[PDB]
Amino acid sequence: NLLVQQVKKLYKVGELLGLDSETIDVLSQPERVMQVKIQIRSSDGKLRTFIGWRSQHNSALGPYKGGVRYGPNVTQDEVIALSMIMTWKNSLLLLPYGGGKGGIRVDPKKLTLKELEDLSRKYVQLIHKYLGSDVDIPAPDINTNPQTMAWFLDEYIKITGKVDFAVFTGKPSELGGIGVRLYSTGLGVATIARDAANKFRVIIQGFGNVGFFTAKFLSEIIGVSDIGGGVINENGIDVNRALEVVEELLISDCDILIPAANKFNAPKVRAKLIVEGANGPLTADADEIMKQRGVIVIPDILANAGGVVGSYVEWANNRSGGIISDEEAKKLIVDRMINAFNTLYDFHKRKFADQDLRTVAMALAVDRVVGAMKARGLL
Amino acid sequence: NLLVQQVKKLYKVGELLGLDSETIDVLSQPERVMQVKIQIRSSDGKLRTFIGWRSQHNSALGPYKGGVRYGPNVTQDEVIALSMIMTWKNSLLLLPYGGGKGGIRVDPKKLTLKELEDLSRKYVQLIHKYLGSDVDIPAPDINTNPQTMAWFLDEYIKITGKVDFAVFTGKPSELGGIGVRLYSTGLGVATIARDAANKFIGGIEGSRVIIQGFGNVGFFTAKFLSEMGAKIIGVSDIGGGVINENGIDVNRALEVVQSTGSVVNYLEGKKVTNEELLISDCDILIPAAVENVINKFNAPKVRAKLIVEGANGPLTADADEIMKQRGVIVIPDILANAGGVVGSYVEWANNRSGGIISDEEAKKLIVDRMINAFNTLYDFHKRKFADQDLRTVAMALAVDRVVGAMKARGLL
Amino acid sequence: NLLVQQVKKLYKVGELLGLDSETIDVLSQPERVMQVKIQIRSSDGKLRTFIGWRSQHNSALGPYKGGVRYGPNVTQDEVIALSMIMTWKNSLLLLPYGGGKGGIRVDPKKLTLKELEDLSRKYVQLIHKYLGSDVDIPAPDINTNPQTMAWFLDEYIKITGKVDFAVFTGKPSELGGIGVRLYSTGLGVATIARDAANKFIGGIEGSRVIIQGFGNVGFFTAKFLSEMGAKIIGVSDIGGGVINENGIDVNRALEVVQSTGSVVNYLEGKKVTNEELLISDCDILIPAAVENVINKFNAPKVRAKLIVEGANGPLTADADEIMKQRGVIVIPDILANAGGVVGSYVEWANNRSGGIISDEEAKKLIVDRMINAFNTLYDFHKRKFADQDLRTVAMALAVDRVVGAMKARGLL
Amino acid sequence: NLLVQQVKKLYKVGELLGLDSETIDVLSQPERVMQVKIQIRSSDGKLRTFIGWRSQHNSALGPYKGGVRYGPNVTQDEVIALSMIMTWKNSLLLLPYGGGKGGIRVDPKKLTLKELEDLSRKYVQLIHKYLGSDVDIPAPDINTNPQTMAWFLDEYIKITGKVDFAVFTGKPSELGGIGVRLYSTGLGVATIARDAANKFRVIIQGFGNVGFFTAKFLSEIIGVSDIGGGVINENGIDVNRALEVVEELLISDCDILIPAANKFNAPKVRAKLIVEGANGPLTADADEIMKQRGVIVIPDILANAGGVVGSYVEWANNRSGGIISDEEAKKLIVDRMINAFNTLYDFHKRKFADQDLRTVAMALAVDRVVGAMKARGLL
Numbered sequence A, D: 001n002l003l004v005q006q007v008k009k010l011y012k013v014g015e016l017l018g019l020d021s022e023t024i025d026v027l028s029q030p031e032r033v034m035q036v037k038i039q040i041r042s043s044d045g046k047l048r049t050f051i052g053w054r055s056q057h058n059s060a061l062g063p064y065k066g067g068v069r070y071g072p073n074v075t076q077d078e079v080i081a082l083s084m085i086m087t088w089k090n091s092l093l094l095l096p097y098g099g100g101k102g103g104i105r106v107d108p109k110k111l112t113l114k115e116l117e118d119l120s121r122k123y124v125q126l127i128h129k130y131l132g133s134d135v136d137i138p139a140p141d142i143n144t145n146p147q148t149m150a151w152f153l154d155e156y157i158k159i160t161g162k163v164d165f166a167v168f169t170g171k172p173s174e175l176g177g178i179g180v181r182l183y184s185t186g187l188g189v190a191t192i193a194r195d196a197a198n199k200f201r202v203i204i205q206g207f208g209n210v211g212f213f214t215a216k217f218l219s220e221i222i223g224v225s226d227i228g229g230g231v232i233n234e235n236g237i238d239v240n241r242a243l244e245v246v247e248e249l250l251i252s253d254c255d256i257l258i259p260a261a262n263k264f265n266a267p268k269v270r271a272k273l274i275v276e277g278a279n280g281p282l283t284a285d286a287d288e289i290m291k292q293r294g295v296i297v298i299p300d301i302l303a304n305a306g307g308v309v310g311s312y313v314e315w316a317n318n319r320s321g322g323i324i325s326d327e328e329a330k331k332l333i334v335d336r337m338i339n340a341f342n343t344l345y346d347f348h349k350r351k352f353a354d355q356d357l358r359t360v361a362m363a364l365a366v367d368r369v370v371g372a373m374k375a376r377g378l379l
Numbered sequence B, C: 001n002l003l004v005q006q007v008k009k010l011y012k013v014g015e016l017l018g019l020d021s022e023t024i025d026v027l028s029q030p031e032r033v034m035q036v037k038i039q040i041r042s043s044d045g046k047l048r049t050f051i052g053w054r055s056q057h058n059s060a061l062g063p064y065k066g067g068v069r070y071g072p073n074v075t076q077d078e079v080i081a082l083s084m085i086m087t088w089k090n091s092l093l094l095l096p097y098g099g100g101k102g103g104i105r106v107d108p109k110k111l112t113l114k115e116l117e118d119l120s121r122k123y124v125q126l127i128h129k130y131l132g133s134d135v136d137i138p139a140p141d142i143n144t145n146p147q148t149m150a151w152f153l154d155e156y157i158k159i160t161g162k163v164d165f166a167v168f169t170g171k172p173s174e175l176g177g178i179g180v181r182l183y184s185t186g187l188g189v190a191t192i193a194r195d196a197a198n199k200f201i202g203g204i205e206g207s208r209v210i211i212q213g214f215g216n217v218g219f220f221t222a223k224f225l226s227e228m229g230a231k232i233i234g235v236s237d238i239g240g241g242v243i244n245e246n247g248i249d250v251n252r253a254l255e256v257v258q259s260t261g262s263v264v265n266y267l268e269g270k271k272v273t274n275e276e277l278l279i280s281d282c283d284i285l286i287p288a289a290v291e292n293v294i295n296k297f298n299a300p301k302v303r304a305k306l307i308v309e310g311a312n313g314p315l316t317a318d319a320d321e322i323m324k325q326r327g328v329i330v331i332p333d334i335l336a337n338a339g340g341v342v343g344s345y346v347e348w349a350n351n352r353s354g355g356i357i358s359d360e361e362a363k364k365l366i367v368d369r370m371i372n373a374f375n376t377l378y379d380f381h382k383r384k385f386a387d388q389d390l391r392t393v394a395m396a397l398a399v400d401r402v403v404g405a406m407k408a409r410g411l412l
């Protein structure tokens, strides 16, 4: 389902780049995927086994990088498909990294912390021979957190005997992690929103992980909204003390609208600059409508990826010995988010002027990968 | 669907054994499965990519063991199912080996010899971190041969720098291999089939034998069984088969394959389809080709007194019941085709020991394990489980050892 | 014969330093040399085998470092000699790197691109146990390029399973490389040549420059030196050269190579032989091709005030003396072409650090080391050793660090 | 010098087997060769550096196997050439092994035991990354002994941290070595001499390492000789108490003559069966003369190689855990010396009947190697 859309999106992009179907077959299918059986024992002695996956999609540009999600609906193909988005995303942001992802078919709610810990450990253990700081670097995803990374990390240290901080990302700050991890996506969305209005009055549909920091860094904001709504105060709201208190907003009248959380309500937004703060804030129709309407949409794969850049800098930090200051890490995100958007402005002019920035982004993502593979003699 | 079948057979025996469905769940699933993408550049510059799998089913009793098949219809699920049967085969014969198997989705016929080498090398290279003399020892299966094993071998020595002969089995005798291994599976099937006939249907001499498949298993099965005084009245391959109730010259039959492509083109006999062969009149039927070839629909029509399973997983679970209902004796593959794995256990053992087992010591090592495992099965059937088919008894033994070993290691 | 020359130059400086001939014997010899046999299958099935070397000269100051050249005349002895100069170059510039170099006896022109890849991969594969990010980091030399480094890279990731970018330097910028590295050697030679001209012959502007060689070093040397206001009045390659006292358009010159094969075919100028070029009238002569190109016989005829050595080992030891006798200043290669190794030190350093050095930080990192090493050499010449040529002073520094480090490690 | 004769002998044999010159180029040149600088410090503080080599000729059939010689005249090319003889010899005796050899340019006489020890250690150390029980297995040669192997062994244990007995051969019996090492060549020469007279009154020019044991096992001997001569007692001399006492013999009248230590004295030997106990007991002329004269000559490469077979069994023993009894090791030499000679009798009939047994032996040696390489896709 996610797979089939990702393969489709890919073949669409391959024809546009002028690629053999055989060359796109390569790009499509993952290099390696492993599946592992995890037996977990409950307090009562009850035995349950759980199946999990690591899809290592592509490593043209570097070692596989990407998080691990726990969930009762995860499937081999969801993991693979998520592999692929990571390949393209890392490519676009010019990271020394390829695409990987992992998942386990489990409902974490139905497990104690002791069982999760045991589950997290055994997954790592069953796949470690294709993990490493220089081969495959997992991270948090859905139902996975810095705590999951500490269990991953400790179990790795148990097997290899090395305190290799950089093998996992999203780690707690006291175990090789870095501070910006929380304001990464935000700093990301913010620095993209700013230099995008420069080339081409803010609203933010959200104030959680991303929205709040997107709001703070940009003001350094006429709208705000929660799962319970917000206020279109034209003053510009106080971004701090909105935290002390914890359809209209989209259609509202602004210069930048930042979804941080359809064809119907698409031709009504008055924002002439979209900075997609989460994944999939628009539909396949609502780009048609935004493109026709001449309103610039900066997509998921770039605007929301201050997080994976944050994990890169965490990775970089570990290898440098943890010397990178928070000041210097901040600047590395902005450098890596500016550089990547200016290559997507410069590719956008010299060719594919006709085309949407999502399609052009992932084009450039594939172009960079195929280019690396050609140079290594892999096609 | 091999998976589905093999899982049903495991539950059948699990419930008999008194195992929780949670335990059987653990046994059922492979510990680790890898799929890998293999890209091949034709001589004209056409790029073809192919998918392969290595299924590492169970490692309670030792490192994973088993063959790799190349074929257009191989699938993740069947290689996992072939994994399963390795586990039981290795357990039944008391080998320090778990169960594993590999497969690639490819039609070797549509590739050149240079393409298959490249293919073979990249397969190994893409999984080699979960291979080893003490991790996972592959071997030949369908459309794989000692040459395949030499490309595998050679590629592993390049990657690691070590001439560890024991990482692959079924190797040419000049590269750490052992001559018996070429024909150990067929010799095993022949040996078991004769013991079975002596104990059940009045012996092997004069006996009318149909063999489906005429490759490394089927040919050698037929050769040895013919040397032993059996009458081989039917033979077949992918191309179809031939029944001659006056017997078939096996060597000449092979020549007809070599000069023709298939064994339907045997001149002295009646051409039959594979389905027709399976239900043709015979004393002993030996499926020595592919799985699930006898099912709920043709099993009522099978005419043999005794089925000896050369191939991995020839009958469905429903076929197993019917054979039981009809009083038709089936020698499990877990025991009948073990001459392969036993032969490669000795190949392996000889490698670690440094090459100091002669070809006759080896031959004896293989035949003896084979018979002893038969006599164990036979005796254990008479004493306990005398109302169950043989595969059930074999499986009981095989599954019990594995669970025992998992218990001790604290895995269960 | 590069070996012979480089050994003489080392004894010259050793005796000056007051080292026992036993010590110089140790310094002289490479710690380890590998030769390997590489077999290549042409598209028609013709088998060609080629010999390559990796010379690991000295590792006192760190892991071995240096390029690989492909060429029909490369020899064990020259790669060992090129090793030596790496040691001194790495020591003079305070890099945590010993000296190494590689070579293959092959004419790349007579191979296809598919043959050179195979060639490049098997070279690495046959020595890879004595390579590593912390053992021996190769890089481009003559007839080797970022593409070569990518085949090397890719083959190493296959063998080991690890994407350690830092195992090779001069890599394409999209595979762990750094853009400055493409032109760091030429930028270094240009930078040093300008500083040298400002301090000795009244500056670089208007200055008449002959460059022998027009590849990765010579072209970029000429480009930057031309950007800096020098007049490049002669250029050459294997095909011969051209002198135009009105200056040569460097970019257009490169185009004449690209569309023609050689730079003799430059339209606006006088065609000369390489020998004629070397002794042609100029302010600054920059050998940026091969070794031993100036010797006892043409050194008396060299017309330049200042020789800047782009290439490794351009003058013989006898040429060095003559240049001294005649008062002709020679900037050692150990310092002039270091922009390469400095550029790849930063490429390497950036890899281990995770890719977080920008291309401008890198550029500055390289230029600064280059100048500082010049100023050190210059100042150290004025204070001690003011009666010795510059190469002697540089060598004094370089050799002394190495012996110091060997002492502390108890190797000497 | 040794090189050029070995390359020549090889190209002679390649044409006879019907091989491309490009295929013989491969076979000729070694796969890898390394050279290492060894600095040794004397008691007086004097520093001396010594250059040494490991030539790893071919590994078609298995890991490189072959000894290390010390000597002031050893050269890279002597080592390479010695590589090659080992490749062919191992092939002929059907060993799971290829050809390697090593040497150091040193006069051991001019070094103390402390300096030799240090020299022996550092050689191993400088090459260990291409040594191992499964990659390259050195042994004793000239000016090298079981004591040299103990220093090799200990230094290896120091680097790797593993007591891998099988990495070196010729070890003292109390450090992974085996008993037959002394009567190996003898048992070799003896069992070859016996089953050769069967197919087709003994003399032995020598009674040292090989001669004595060749004499004992065969009697279980009308001639004997030393560097100081012997006695042609027609009784058959007492082989034991000849040890208690420590041109004519060759020309003498016997059925088997066994040189254990030229055209001129070649047409006079009355022996109709030569079992070459040392290397090069005949000349390139004296085979012409022996062949013409119809007198069967069993060459160096097979008859004297009970030693390398002995080291194989030592190797085999180490890997099996040192369980092989002296009884069982004895039988393994004879099995490996019979098998190898019966393949050289069976190849000799089916083809190359016209040809000498030296040329036919090394033919079969090359045929087996090229065959293995073909199967591995190496030519």
Ligand SMILES: NC(=O)c1ccc[n+]([C@@H]2O[C@H](COP(=O)([O-])OP(=O)(O)OC[C@H]3O[C@@H](n4cnc5c(N)ncnc54)[C@H](O)[C@@H]3O)[C@@H](O)[C@H]2O)c1
Binding pocket: B067, B140, B141, B142, B143, B144, B170, B185, B186, B212, B213, B214, B215, B216, B217, B218, B236, B237, B238, B239, B274, B288, B289, B290, B291, B310, B311, B312, B337, B340
């Ligand atoms: N001895 C071994 O190396 C070995 C090892 C492992 C497993 N096995 C098992 O034994 C069986 C035989 O394999 P093999 O090694 O002889 O293979 P093979 O490739 O040597 O020969 C296969 C034979 O089966 C025939 N065949 C293929 N598809 C067929 C079909 N659909 N219907 C009928 N015949 C068909 C082929 O034409 C050929 O005659 C397989 O089930 C295999 O899993 C054998």
Ligand SMILES: NC(=O)c1ccc[n+]([C@@H]2O[C@H](COP(=O)([O-])OP(=O)(O)OC[C@H]3O[C@@H](n4cnc5c(N)ncnc54)[C@H](O)[C@@H]3O)[C@@H](O)[C@H]2O)c1
Binding pocket: C067, C140, C141, C142, C143, C144, C170, C185, C186, C212, C213, C214, C215, C216, C217, C218, C236, C237, C238, C239, C274, C288, C289, C290, C291, C310, C311, C312, C337, C340
């Ligand atoms: N920047 C680098 O990558 C690098 C690295 C290490 C060493 N170097 C040294 O710098 C020098 C230049 O090498 P490069 O990288 O520019 O090589 P290159 O292969 O890029 O170019 C070689 C150039 O020299 C010319 N040449 C070749 N043989 C010649 C001859 N006999 N006479 C005159 N010209 C000849 C070629 O035609 C070409 O113009 C060499 O001595 C090399 O050892 C350069």
Ligand SMILES: CCCC(=O)C(=O)O
Binding pocket: B065, B066, B067, B068, B086, B101, B138, B139, B140, B141, B169, B312, B337, B338, B340, B341, B344
């Ligand atoms: C040696 C493995 C044989 C095999 O895979 C089989 O018998 O199925």
Ligand SMILES: CCCC(=O)C(=O)O
Binding pocket: C065, C066, C067, C068, C086, C101, C138, C139, C140, C141, C169, C312, C337, C338, C340, C341, C344
């Ligand atoms: C980075 C190595 C460069 C080199 O080999 C040289 O400058 O000679």
